[PDB]
């Protein structure tokens, strides 16, 4: 069963970020994707009123592996694939920034 | 040291026995009917229950040890005396043995017959974590050679697996002789002076 | 024997001489009837259902063996698992559970900075049972057991919104490996060996003379032997503690078919009882002796 | 048409010792785990081991009692002027004699005729920088005569050839791989320590008798640094459901929770943890519970601590004495210098997110250890350890010494700040005033552990023994001369136990340990002898090309899959957890790996690489693919069938590898390997015994202690020794009856025996059971006459 | 934020064909090696379950399926930058991953094992 | 001793005369007692007497 | 050390047959049994003498600490 | 998100307190204060069950496929050899093996009669 | 029995039991005179 490419990204355009099992988010923040000039790593951010998420490149990860994500369609079996980094991303909570004195007694 | 041509060819013949006690005392204490191949996956399961074990390993092991010895002592019994090429009187070897003034048959018998299984610490080889007592042998192999059952004999020479495996009960021996905490000195001492 | 005389020896024994009128079944059924029993070997599975509402709710049902199976292999009753469940158990399982809070809330966690030491749908007669167990239990609520075929035993533990998370199979566990639902004191178990020299006996892993005068129907009271010397003289008198010196001591000789003369080990024996008692021979042994100048260079 | 001793070609080697390449390469291939040893403390990539050595004990800090008279609540805070002394490079000259003026080289035979040390100069720069190097001076101190290894990188005698060495008072064939400390050759003996960078499965009842409710579970991993410096970490599992980090500083043992030193190492959710150790085995009840007891735990405990910085700060505060970091090192300078030193310190400094994948592993490891999903793991075993080699633990008390060295020059300074004041730190005459009232000499202190075996240090290493970690190198003869540089112990602390299984001969051995060759009596099964193929790492390369060949393979990253457990293989490179696989795909990347390892056609992937695939298996081994390639390791080689070609092969991985001994012995669809000859399974001198196959196994191993205790050849440069004794056999003959071996280490060279016509005879009746009867007329004509 | 340095904010964003109709929508990610060229390939051979077969230029890859947290992230608007995929979060439809395979080479026996 | 773990202490120096002499007219230099041989098992000493013999010839 | 003078088992003279035997080995090319029966080496005891000798008297003789270099 | 007996938030992923520790009618993350619960989280139930190797017994033992018992008598010694019994005079003897003393010291033999049933040991 | 001082030299006590004590290594036991020591030879024409 060969499957038929209709078209192929080599530009920035969507990407995936793995959080945690069981991540929900308010699904009206947006996040800010960064680009560095072999292979480019790319670096994850976002804003909300109560967290934050911040996002990057596995270095061993991006110059081994290449990430691709496409869409399928049920009739016509063609796939348009575009390039996908992987970031691994952490999110940070209004309770970080809290820190005591560098020196207790 | 040398067995006649007729006593070699019985030597073989009960020795060719052998190969199939390996698999038969596996087939015993894992209980199955018909006797199962050697590589069958329900018996490989079943061996490896078996190794996990302290106490399971040691029926399997006490089983074997039985079967494969009870083919030793048919060879001893078949190949010494009416085997031997050269005989008692002339045959030194057998003389010194049967004279009392050194060796026993046990030691003629490992000598021109075989060195038989090699027992470390009342149980037969030990075995690794994946089921293998040497890596050469295949893991959970239903075979007497691979639990330490020599059929070679001094004479004629021993393989480098039974070799190692001699190299084990060897040692074993002289290790026990090292770990020995037990003095007769101090007994002795305590009722000297009390009875003296 | 001879350096120590120990009261407190390693493998006490007694040699129990069974009838010729008692079969090898009975005689079986019998060493299973002295055998010490734990909850351990007659129970298959523990499931502990810990669910918070409302209270830490704790069911914990117990599947056993067969009915059949464990009073065929240890000579105990669904009557008898009843009583040590209802009566030891529980209190086992309280008490256990308490000293686990306390652990709790005592140390919080291990001291950081500080160094440690180096490493090298019920019946009405159910009903008045539970009644009357709850009366008993300061936290146990439903209480209902196999009576008919004699398989399970399902009980809920009720515990405060304080008490929070706990590793109840855990504990469960090690006090079933503790509760002891029959044993004779003294003895762990009785097992039937092959007849020594012809004479049918059973060997027991435990001393405790007086509990097997009881047992008149299967066993010879007056060849009962034993290993242990020091229990001997308790029961019988220093000529008998004497005997199973001598006897003792060719035990050791014997096996590994050394031949010491018994001139030399009834010298021994009526040395170690000179004055009644056990002696040993070593410093406690030699303080009833005349010479000071061979005490002197002893030790 | 026979296998002949070579004697037209003997006495032509004999009269003309070769100019080229030295005969017997066997001979240096013995000595090559010391050599090299010593060789990479230098010599090699990154500097060698003591120059890494210097770069990781780092600096030492002391602040003048000096005002800063400004024009404020800065003068009260302010500490002084800052001084940080470190040394940037470490020199080793070869043996020199200076008379003040111009140098001359001082060869071993000078050494050994004087009775006094082999000793090569010791130079280290150190670095005096002031105030975070606003000002910085260097110097380059000598530190004394530090004791040079015979044939090394620092020895004079490496580049001599046969004919050279002659002409140099020394053996044609000069083994070296000792010391010539006071005119006695001492040499470092081996050791057998825990295999680096792996997590070990371990049931201990010493775990239980520590503290409260402790079981005898336990994962126990000792991390290595590239100065070969060993840090071990320990996970207890506690009856409570609490889990603690173990380790030691100083020579004191310190108990932390794991949920702690996690959070202290990256940013995480409670819930990152929960996917790092659960997997898709979010089902199993047993792990459900314990995971909670964790999370809970430290949330009762320390609910104060809500980020990184945080914990950082916690642990700062508590071991800011112990670490000695102090005064102006702020608690999150401490707590992260505490991690940098102590947690999986074989990851390194910039490897946090990797130490922290590597800690969760551990906690799966451990939880499947209590349960039983995993049988623990044998430290005693051949395949669970690796061997410390002479010239390695040389570097690591050398490290000791200069990390003791620089504190001196602190307390010099602390001790001047304390009374008179004296002046400033940027004057380079105060730095030279406070280096001359420190003792300096390093090379005496390196001289007394060769000279004692006595381990003096601070932290004790890794160790457990604490004396004779060196030998005199006993030359009574040639045979038990060259068994020393074969000999491993397994430690002075386990010659003390009433264990029988640390003495146990294992099949693990095979090819690595050789059966016949260990002592009787006491140092039975405890001073072992390796096989003569047998080799050892010295260190590693390609390294760090090969995560790309195993992601192109179908690695899963582990920063992305999110997934742990003994139900899915696990992917390391010398304790890097890379990715995450299936168990099936997991022997299919370690069997093609082998395939490309083997063909010279692969750039990166060394064939010297160790590749232990563990399969699943019930209630046996914890799986998973762990890749090695670091120094200390056991190798061996073997003939791999498809390609027909060497490979070598790990005592860790060889357990569930198929070697047939023979090639006639070979089965189908059930081996992968065969041996060259089953000759590498043993010693030398158990090569050496002949017809040895046909000898009962006491007799075998009693003969290597005989040939050991003969009186035979112990040299013939003896005109140019003083050793305290030597025997000498007049009469050397070449054996009839040998293995071709004998030639390979050109034992011809030392004869150790002669062939006499031996009758089996009881004709005098002065010979019975351990009395042999010597020929009067022979003894006459000079038959076994000695010196 | 604004750091680590040398990194420029990603202002054009190409176009996403989202919409999850109902004759259904199937999303797909694919895993690959850089050896590999993604633009000299314009068809692959893919089939259900583990089994799969593929050589491009001389190197044999196999494609492994499988069923079953990763979170994708659709660009809504080029300035809009990237916002989470929703329908009613968002899950692959079917997950893909392409492993090099090597064929290891069958041991001559006739020419190894000899008497 | 020989190579195969078989050691003995020299308990005199016989004579040549007094030493049994082969038909080849050679009395060996060292005696060892055949009762040695039973409780070693060391056989790889027997086939180096026979080995040892060939070569020398 | 040098080639000793009679075989240590009959007494058969052995010390002037050394250098004669590499002769026969070197520059008549024999074997090593066809030269040491030309030398007049019958007995295996006194074949075995000459055949089994090193001769690392050679060896010893290499250092000299009466000549420079 | 819920799993078990733990409850983890959905914003940042730390671990919810118990509802019975807290105040009542509404739960709260330490990281950041959100807005929980749902009442929809229900009454949370974990099925443990025993460790199976927990209770080690005869009858545990019996449901081993494997033999894990050998009988009373089945189980005959293997080793046997031709030697003269002192006892009466019988042919059939068993014999065990070991290296006992130093590597010089010879093999102790440990005879053993199927008659009667009678230990034995001799060196030589 | 006295005080520790910065191992202590032996009393009259210490004196009578140094290691087997006085009693046990010369009294029971003693080195004898008219007394030799060899390595044994074995002798079957004695
Ligand atoms: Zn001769
Ligand atoms: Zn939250
Ligand atoms: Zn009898």
Redesign the pocket.
């Known amino acids: 069963s060969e499957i038929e490419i209709e078209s192929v990204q080599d530009q920035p355009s969507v990407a995936v970020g793995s959080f945690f099992k069981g991540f929900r988010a308010p699904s009206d923040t947006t996040f800010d994707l960064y680009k560095k000039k072999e292979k480019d790593e790319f670096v994850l951010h976002g804003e909300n009123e109560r967290l934050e998420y911040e996002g990057y490149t596995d270095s061993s990860s991006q110059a081994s592996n290449q990430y691709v994500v496409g869409l399928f369609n049920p009739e016509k079996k063609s796939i348009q694939l575009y390039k996908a980094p992987v970031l691994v991303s952490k999110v940070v ?1 209004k309770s970080s920034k809290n820190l005591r004195g560098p020196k207790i007694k | 040291l040398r067995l006649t041509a007729e006593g070699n060819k019985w030597r073989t013949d009960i020795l060719k026995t052998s190969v199939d006690t390996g698999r038969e005392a596996a087939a015993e204490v894992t209980n199955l009917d018909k006797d199962t191949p050697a590589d069958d996956p329900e018996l490989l399961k079943r061996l490896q229950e078996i190794l996990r074990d302290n106490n399971k390993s040691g029926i399997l092991d006490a089983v074997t040890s039985s079967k494969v010895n009870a083919i030793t002592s048919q060879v001893v019994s078949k190949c010494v005396p009416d085997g031997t090429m050269k005989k008692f009187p002339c045959n030194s070897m057998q003389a010194m043995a049967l004279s009392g003034a050194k060796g026993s048959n046990v030691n003629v018998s490992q000598i021109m017959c075989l060195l038989g299984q090699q027992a470390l610490e009342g149980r037969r080889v030990p075995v690794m974590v994946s089921g293998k007592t040497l890596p050469s042998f295949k893991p959970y192999e239903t075979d007497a050679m691979a639990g330490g059952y020599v059929k070679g004999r001094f004479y004629s020479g021993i393989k480098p697996q039974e070799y190692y495996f001699h190299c084990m009960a060897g040692r074993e021996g002289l290790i026990d002789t090292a770990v020995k905490t037990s003095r007769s000195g101090y007994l002795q001492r305590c009722l000297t002076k009390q009875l003296e | 024997i001879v350096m120590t005389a120990s009261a407190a020896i390693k493998t006490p024994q007694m040699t129990l001489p069974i009838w010729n009128d008692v079969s090898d079944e009975q005689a079986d059924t019998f060493c299973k009837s002295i055998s010490k029993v734990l909850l351990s070997e007659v129970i298959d599975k523990v499931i502990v259902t810990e669910t918070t509402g409302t209270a830490r709710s704790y069911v914990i049902h117990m599947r056993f063996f067969d009915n059949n199976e464990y009073s065929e292999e240890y000579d105990v009753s669904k009557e008898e698992l009843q009583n040590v469940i209802s009566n030891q158990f529980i209190h086992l399982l309280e008490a256990a559970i308490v000293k686990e809070i306390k652990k709790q809330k005592r140390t919080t966690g291990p001291d950081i900075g500080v160094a440690v030491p180096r490493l090298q749908n019920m019946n009405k007669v159910q009903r008045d049972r539970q009644s009357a167990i709850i009366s008993h239990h300061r936290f146990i609520t439903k209480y209902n057991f196999d009576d008919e075929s004699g398989k399970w035993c399902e009980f809920k533990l009720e515990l405060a919104a304080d008490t929070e998370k706990l590793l109840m199979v855990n504990i469960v566990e090690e006090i079933c490996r503790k509760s002891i639902i029959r044993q004779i004191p003294h003895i762990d178990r009785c097992v039937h060996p092959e007849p020594e020299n012809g004479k049918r006996v059973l060997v027991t892993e435990g001393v405790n003379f007086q509990a097997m005068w009881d047992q008149e129907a299967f066993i010879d009271v007056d060849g009962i032997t034993s290993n242990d010397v020091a229990a001997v003289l308790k029961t019988y008198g220093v000529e008998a503690a004497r005997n199973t010196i001598v006897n003792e001591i060719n035990n050791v000789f014997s096996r590994y078919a050394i031949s010491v003369s018994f001139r030399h080990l009834d010298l021994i024996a009526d040395m170690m009882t000179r004055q009644g008692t056990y002696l040993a021979f070593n410093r406690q042994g030699m303080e009833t002796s005349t010479s000071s100048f061979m005490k002197m260079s002893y030790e | 048409r026979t296998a002949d001793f070579r004697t037209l070609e003997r006495e032509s080697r004999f009269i003309n010792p070769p100019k080229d390449k030295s005969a017997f390469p066997l001979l240096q291939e013995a000595v090559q785990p010391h050599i090299g040893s010593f060789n990479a403390l230098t010599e090699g990539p990154d500097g060698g081991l003591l120059n890494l050595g210097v770069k990781d004990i780092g600096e030492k800090v002391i602040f003048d009692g000096k005002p800063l008279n400004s024009e404020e609540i800065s003068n009260s805070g302010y500490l002084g002027n800052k001084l940080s002394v470190s040394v940037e490079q470490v020199s080793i000259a070869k043996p020199m004699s200076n008379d003040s003026a111009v140098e001359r080289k001082v060869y071993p035979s000078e050494s050994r005729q004087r009775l006094t040390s082999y000793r090569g100069k010791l130079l280290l720069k150190l670095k005096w920088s002031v105030n975070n190097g606003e000002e910085n001076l260097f110097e380059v101190r000598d530190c004394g005569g530090l004791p040079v290894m015979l044939q090394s990188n620092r020895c004079h005698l490496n580049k001599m050839s046969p004919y050279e060495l002659v002409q140099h008072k020394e053996e044609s064939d000069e083994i070296g791989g000792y010391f010539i400390v006071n005119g006695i050759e001492k040499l470092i003996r081996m050791l057998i320590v825990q295999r680096r960078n792996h997590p070990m499965a371990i049931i201990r009842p010493s775990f239980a008798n520590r503290g409260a409710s402790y079981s005898h579970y336990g994962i126990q991993i000792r991390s290595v640094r590239p100065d070969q410096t060993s840090q071990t970490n320990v996970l207890h599992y506690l009856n409570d459901g609490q889990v603690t980090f173990r380790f030691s500083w100083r020579k004191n043992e310190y108990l932390v929770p794991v949920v702690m030193i996690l959070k202290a190492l990256c940013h995480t959710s409670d819930r990152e943890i929960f996917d790092g150790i659960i997997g898709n085995d979010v089902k199993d009840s047993f792990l459900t519970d314990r995971l909670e007891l964790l999370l809970r735990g430290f949330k009762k405990r320390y609910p104060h601590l809500q980020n990184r910085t945080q914990v950082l700060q916690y642990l700062g505060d508590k071991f800011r004495v112990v670490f000695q970091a102090s005064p102006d090192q702020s608690d999150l300078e401490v707590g992260q210098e505490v991690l940098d030193r102590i947690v999986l310190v074989h990851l390194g400094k910039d490897g946090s997110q990797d130490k922290f994948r590597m800690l969760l592993f551990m906690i799966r490891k451990l939880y499947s250890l209590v349960a039983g999903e995993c049988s623990p793991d044998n430290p005693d075993a051949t395949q669970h350890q690796e061997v410390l080699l002479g010239g390695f633990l040389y570097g690591m008390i050398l490290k000791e010494k200069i990390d003791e060295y620089l504190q001196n020059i602190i307390a010099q300074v602390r001790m001047d700040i304390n009374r008179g004041m004296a002046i400033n730190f940027k004057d380079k005459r105060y730095m030279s005033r406070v280096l001359m009232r420190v003792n300096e000499n390093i090379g005496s202190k390196m001289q007394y552990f060769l000279s004692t075996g006595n381990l003096v240090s601070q932290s004790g290493l890794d160790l457990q023994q604490v004396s004779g970690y060196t030998v005199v190198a006993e030359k009574i003869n040639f045979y038990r001369f060259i068994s020393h540089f074969r000999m491993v112990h397994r430690g002075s602390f386990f010659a003390q136990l009433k264990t029988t299984t640390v003495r146990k001969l294992l099949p693990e051995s095979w090819g690595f340990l050789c059966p016949v060759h260990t002592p009787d009596g006491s140092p039975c099964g405890l001073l072992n002898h390796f096989a003569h193929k047998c080799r050892i790492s010295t260190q590693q390369s390609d390294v760090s090309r090969i995560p790309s060949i195993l992601y192109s393979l179908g690695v899963a990253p582990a920063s992305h899959t999110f997934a742990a457990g003994p139900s899915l293989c696990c992917v390391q490179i010398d304790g890097k957890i890379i990715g995450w696989v299936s168990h099936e795909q997991g022997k299919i990347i370690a069997d093609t790996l082998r395939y490309w390892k083997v063909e010279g056609k692969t750039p990166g992937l060394p064939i010297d690489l160790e590749i232990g695939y563990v399969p699943p298996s019930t209630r046996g081994q914890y799986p998973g693919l762990y890749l090695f390639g670091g120094h200390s390791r056991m190798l061996r080689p073997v003939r791999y069938l498809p390609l027909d070609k060497e490979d070598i092969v790990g005592p860790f991985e060889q357990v569930y590898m198929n070697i047939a001994v023979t090639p006639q012995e070979i089965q189908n669809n059930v081996h992968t390997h065969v041996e060259f000859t089953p000759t590498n399974i043993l010693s030398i001198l158990a090569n050496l015994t002949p017809f040895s196959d046909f000898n009962q196994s006491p007799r075998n191993m009693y003969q290597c202690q005989m040939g050991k205790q003969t009186m035979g050849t112990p040299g013939v440069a003896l005109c140019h020794r003083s050793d305290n004794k030597l025997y000498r056999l007049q009469t050397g003959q070449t054996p009839i009856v040998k293995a071709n071996l004998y030639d390979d280490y050109g034992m011809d060279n030392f004869p150790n025996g002669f062939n006499a016509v031996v009758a089996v005879i009881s004709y005098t009746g002065y010979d019975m059971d351990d009395a042999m009867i010597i020929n009067k007329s022979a003894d006459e004509r000079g038959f076994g006459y000695g010196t | 934020f604004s750091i680590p340095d040398g990194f420029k904010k990603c202002k054009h964003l190409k176009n996403f064909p989202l919409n999850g109709d109902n004759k259904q929508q199937q999303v797909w990610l694919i895993k690959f090696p850089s050896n590999v060229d993604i633009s000299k390939l314009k068809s692959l051979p893919v089939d259900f379950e583990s089994s799969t077969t593929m050589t491009i230029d001389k190197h044999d890859y196999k494609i492994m399926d499988d069923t079953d947290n990763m979170t994708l992230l659709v660009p809504s608007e080029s300035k809009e930058s990237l916002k989470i995929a929703s329908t009613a979060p968002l899950q692959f439809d079917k997950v893909f991953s392409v492993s090099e395979t090597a064929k290891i080479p069958a041991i001559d026996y006739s020419k190894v094992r000899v008497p | 001793s020989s190579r195969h773990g078989q050691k003995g202490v020299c308990s005199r120096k016989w004579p040549t005369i007094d030493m049994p002499f082969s038909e080849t007219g050679i009395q060996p230099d060292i005696i060892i007692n055949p009762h040695a041989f039973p409780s070693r098992m060391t056989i790889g000493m027997f086939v180096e007497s026979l080995a040892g013999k060939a070569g020398a010839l | 050390m040098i080639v000793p003078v009679r075989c240590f088992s009959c007494g058969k003279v052995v010390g002037d047959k050394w250098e004669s035997y590499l002769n026969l080995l070197q520059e008549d090319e024999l074997d090593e049994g066809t030269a040491l029966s030309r030398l007049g080496l019958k007995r295996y005891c006194c074949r075995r003498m000459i055949l089994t000798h090193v001769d690392l008297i050679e060896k010893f003789l290499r250092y000299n600490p009466l000549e420079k270099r | 998100s819920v799993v078990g007996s733990l409850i983890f ?1 959905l ?2 992923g ?1 671990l919810l307190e118990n509802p019975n520790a807290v105040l009542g009618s509404n739960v709260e ?1 330490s ?2 204060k ?1 807005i929980y619960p749902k009442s929809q989280f229900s009454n949370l139930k974990v099925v443990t069950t025993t460790a199976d190797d927990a209770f080690p017994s005869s009858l545990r033992a019996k449901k081993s496929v494997v033999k894990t018992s050998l009988k009373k008598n089945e189980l005959k010694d293997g080793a046997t050899i031709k030697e003269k019994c002192p006892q009466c005079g019988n042919e059939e003897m068993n014999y065990h093996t070991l290296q006992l003393r130093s590597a010089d010291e010879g093999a102790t033999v440990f005879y053993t009669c199927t008659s009667c049933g009678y230990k034995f040991r001799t060196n030589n | 029995k006295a005080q520790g001082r910065t191992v202590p030299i032996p009393g009259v006590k210490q004196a009578l039991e140094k290691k087997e004590g006085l009693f046990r290594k010369h009294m029971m036991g003693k080195r004898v005179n008219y007394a030799a020591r060899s390595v044994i030879s074995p002798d079957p024409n004695i």
């Open positions: 909570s | 938030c914003d940042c730390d993350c990281q950041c959100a």
